[PDB]
Amino acid sequence: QLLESGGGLVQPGGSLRLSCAASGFTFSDEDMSWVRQAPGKGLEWVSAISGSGGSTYYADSVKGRFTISRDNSKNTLYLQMNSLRAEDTAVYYCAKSYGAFDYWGQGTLVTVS
């Protein structure tokens, strides 16, 4: 169970803070990600954070604008979004980074030409 909140309408250049509430697992020990789906597009990975909070990771498109963070005492994940742009319009989801696959080391290529 993960429940996102904080979405809304923002002017370009604006800020917004998304919150994700986790339950039913040891949050402290889980690497968490934010991912998003722009309208019509697929799922795009935005940011990730280690269990401790000691390591953070950002997609090139958001590096320097977004800040990922967590509060393990409150079992909650955050995404602070600043300097927002049209490209940032999307449905945002929080997710366990490695709960499903491993994206970075997986994959097989199918080319239909």
Task: Tell me the chain's radius of gyration from C-alpha atoms.
Answer: 15
d(CA 50, CA 29): 8
* 85's tokens: 């742009």
CA distance 81 to 76: 16
| CATH 2.60.130.10 assigned to 1-113 | no
Domain ranges of the chain: 1-113
SS (H, E, C) 3-48: EEECCCCCCCCCCEEEEEEECCCCHHHCCEEEEEECCCCCEEEEEE
Pick from 42, 34, 30: nearest CA to 99: 30
Method: X-ray
- Look at strands 2-5 and 16-22 and give their pairing: antiparallel
Q: What angle do CA 54, 59, 63 make, to 5 degrees?
A: 75
